Design a protein around this ligand. Structure first.
Ligand code: HEM
Ligand code: HEM
Ligand SMILES: Cc1cc(N)nc(CCc2cc(F)cc(CC[C@H]3CCCN3)c2)c1
Ligand SMILES: Cc1cc(N)nc(CCc2cc(F)cc(CC[C@H]3CCCN3)c2)c1
Ligand SMILES: Cc1cc(N)nc(CCc2cc(F)cc(CC[C@H]3CCCN3)c2)c1
Ligand SMILES: Cc1cc(N)nc(CCc2cc(F)cc(CC[C@H]3CCCN3)c2)c1
Ligand SMILES: [Cl-]
Ligand SMILES: [Cl-]
Ligand SMILES: [Gd]
Ligand SMILES: [Gd]
Ligand SMILES: [Zn+2]
Ligand SMILES: [Zn+2]
Ligand SMILES: [Zn+2]
Lengths: 402, 404
């Protein structure tokens, strides 16, 4: 009773034996599927640890060995003495890559083995935290030739508060409410904008103002840090044939760096471990610029394209959306900033599924997030059945610290 | 009671209808199988319990529970089963059940129309030639010279032992799929299997790329016979593009009527292996799936060449550009031919309205996100940012085996 999985474009059939090792539970039952939902002491800690150590010593082709049982013994002992334990640096690097490998909504996982892991577990203050983060952005950005990286700040521990980054990403544009009641800038960031302001930030008045970082050291209020402007690489948006497009004044930033998730490794939790890769072009063109509740530029673009916005059957929305994505891809290519289109991304993810089926006998994947938000059935992932389940190590959502 | 959020507007509801479900779906707390096309794979004490439930919701809907003529229908059904083991549906229950099965179909985006359904009762049928005449009435009525009307024809229910009425084609109108020299196909690769059962039962093959296949109708026990569809009864649309002069030269056509003829209508514990239903097309069905799927007519590159697109790099979005124009041509061609069609923007906006209606009426609506979101421009439609709950209600259209 392993789930049969078929690709309907090709006829391929595989069975997902890895789903049976699903170490935690999701929102569905045989009664009802909730898959489309966005948001779905020593004893428990010890069994998560053993399982991880077992994964680690499996990875280095040394399972059941002297060093393996030694480490198992050491951890049980350390959990007894201290209520927790510390990862070796090599185990941390393995745990970070596994968390990415296990991330079911990530279409970029072909890259999972090429992750740069910065060990900031010795961080002591928000000021030091800032320095680490500035170094992360600099290395990952690499002048436009982007590299995947994660920085791990100290784990959660009894008796002390968490390191937390309040910003959902290291680079975000501000969202300012208006007299029209409207939002100027990115409506997704209204809340964090208001927090920065009341923590002493002097707001701008533009549409693409980079937000400061609110960094929280254990048992301190958050501290405001401005990003040096020369650290935040940005791409002005132009279209290769639509010359008035450059006159919209649109821009986006190079580095997508998610900073508000919790990294979990062997029962240990790291509430602050921001990670970054590079953008797939629909994230910018379709979601960030075209969503009605984001920058919502679609109608303004279609009107300038001289399209008939009076009826839906002319597909003015689809035509304007495609050209916005073309503009994104062309602009990042022009600027020499890494970018991947959804055709290339989904093709590599299909190679990733093949690799994972041989390696682990399956691959956790969230169809609704893996299939891009435009041209879905034109990509190979559309016709591929997928099994969604939760493996550890893992990135998890966590509540906002405020 | 699942919380259900719309991330575009921020509105919240609670799906209370989900609790009243349950033919068991495929998901478990440890793994979601929501993307699987077939939920896994395919002494009558429980016939009564399914009939009582159905009868109860028929009288619920007509303001008529607790007094009444519903207690009397309750007893005639159990006397009927106590006597013959099965039972016959009143004609209005049959109408009510057919509409409820459509209303309950999680994968159907067109359900705002679920109240306008023409139900032809064909249970007194007994010959495959009769069937062909029923099917021919339906098609004629449903087509209505291009002003399509939703319709289902309900054939005799499966009964203890005996045999099955069964249409063998997957739809009433299907184009031919001829394998070949290369192991390649001319026509529709989706219909290769049935194109060969047609010829192995006596059909003379045809031209190629757009040959309406003949019907394979199976009366109980008796083996299936072939029937030719009159070209007068099969309305078709030549595809042309409003501004791309050469598009008509590609010789593309599609048919007017989508009529699913292989699913099993189940009402109150009764099974109807032959109950073809029909509506009208959403344009992405034709242009995106049927014409552009790599395993269907696979025309994307041909159109891209004619548009002189940069097919040498994926980042030109030449697939995306070509695909939109094929959809523009589908819509324009149906409109010019005055054949009812609906685009995915209009269709999903109507579905959002359906969701609002269903929340007031029944406290929710089973919906399959992966099938409700259109196959192109998903996030541009209002259903993309709408969370949905999938579950099985009865009456339903179910998948069923294939008599091969
Ligand atoms: C290197 C290139 C990468 C690409 C192209 C990529 C792509 C994506 C995309 C497209 C999504 C969400 C679907 C969407 O927004 O349309 C996503 C989600 C995600 N990615 Fe990747 N990613 C990359 C690197 C990484 C790295 C380095 C990590 C962690 C080490 C990671 C972990 C995740 C996680 C956890 C999610 C889900 C986030 C959430 O649910 O909020 N990704 N990725
Ligand atoms: C009248 C206009 C109708 C429209 C526009 C429509 C549209 C659709 C679409 C678009 C799908 C599949 C999703 C996709 O391919 O993207 C679908 C599936 C379905 N529809 Fe509707 N439909 C209509 C009428 C009907 C009627 C009259 C019935 C039944 C009486 C029905 C029952 C179903 C069922 C059972 C499915 C699922 C089929 C399967 O699982 O293979 N629909 N419909
Ligand atoms: C490292 C990385 C690279 C990349 N190229 N892309 C991403 C995904 C960015 C992203 C995409 C989304 F679609 C939504 C979010 C925020 C998700 C919040 C909302 C609900 C739960 N978490 C972030 C991450
Ligand atoms: C993962 C996935 C998601 C989605 N949203 N859609 C699909 C394809 C649905 C589909 C459409 C068709 F048009 C035909 C088939 C298979 C029919 C074959 C199998 C047996 C007999 N005929 C499947 C797959
Ligand atoms: C009445 C009606 C109107 C309309 N406008 N559209 C449809 C949908 C036709 C359709 C769409 C699909 F996407 C797949 C199928 C058949 C595939 C089989 C294999 C597995 C499940 N069904 C049929 C039906
Ligand atoms: C049903 C559905 C399917 C899908 N495939 N995608 C979505 C949108 C998911 C999404 C993307 C974003 F980019 C941002 C959010 C909300 C983030 C809010 C919550 C808390 C803080 N910000 C949600 C919805
Ligand atoms: Cl983003
Ligand atoms: Cl079809
Ligand atoms: Gd131009
Ligand atoms: Gd060319
Ligand atoms: Zn599920
Ligand atoms: Zn969106
Ligand atoms: Zn398809």
């Amino acid at each position: 009773k392993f789930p049969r999985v078929k690709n309907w474009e090709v006829g391929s059939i595989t069975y997902d034996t890895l789903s049976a090792q699903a170490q935690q539970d999701g929102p569905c039952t045989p009664r009802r599927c909730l898959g489309s939902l966005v948001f779905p002491a020593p004893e428990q800690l010890l069994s998560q640890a053993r399982d991880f150590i077992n994964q680690y010593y499996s990875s280095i082709k040394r399972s059941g060995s002297q060093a393996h049982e030694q480490r198992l013994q050491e951890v049980e002992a350390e959990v007894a003495a201290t209520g927790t334990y510390q990862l070796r640096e090599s185990e941390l690097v393995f745990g970070a890559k596994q968390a990415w490998r296990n991330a079911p909504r990530c279409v970029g996982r072909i890259q999972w083995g090429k992750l740069q892991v910065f060990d900031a577990r010795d961080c002591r203050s928000a000021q030091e935290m800032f320095t680490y983060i500035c170094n992360h952005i600099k290395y990952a950005t690499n002048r436009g030739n982007l590299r995947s990286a994660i920085t791990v700040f100290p784990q959660r521990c009894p008796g002390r508060g968490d390191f937390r980054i309040w910003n959902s990403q290291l680079v975000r544009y501000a969202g300012y409410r208006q007299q029209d009641g409207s939002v100027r800038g990115d409506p997704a960031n209204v809340e964090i904008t208001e927090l920065c302001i009341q923590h002493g930030w002097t707001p701008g008045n533009g549409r693409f103002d980079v937000l400061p970082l609110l960094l929280q050291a254990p048992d301190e209020p958050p501290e405001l840090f401005l990003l040096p402007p020369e650290l935040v690489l940005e791409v002005p948006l132009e279209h290769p044939t639509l010359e008035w497009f450059a006159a919209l004044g649109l821009r986006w930033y190079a580095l997508p760096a998610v900073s508000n998730m919790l990294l979990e490794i062997g029962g240990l939790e790291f509430p602050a471990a921001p990670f970054s890769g590079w953008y797939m072009s629909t994230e910018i063109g379709t979601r960030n610029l075209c969503d009605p509740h984001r920058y919502n530029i679609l109608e303004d673009v279609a009107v300038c394209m001289d399209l008939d916005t009076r009826t839906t059957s002319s597909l003015w929305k689809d035509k304007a959306a495609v050209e916005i994505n073309v503009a994104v891809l062309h602009s990042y290519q022009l600027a020499k900033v890494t970018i991947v289109d959804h055709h290339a991304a989904t093709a590599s993810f299909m190679k990733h599924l093949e690799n994972e089926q041989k390696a682990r006998g399956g691959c956790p994947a969230d169809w609704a997030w893996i299939v891009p938000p435009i041209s879905g059935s034109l990509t190979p992932v559309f016709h591929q059945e997928m099994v969604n389940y939760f493996l550890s190590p893992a990135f998890r959502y966590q509540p906002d610290p405020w």
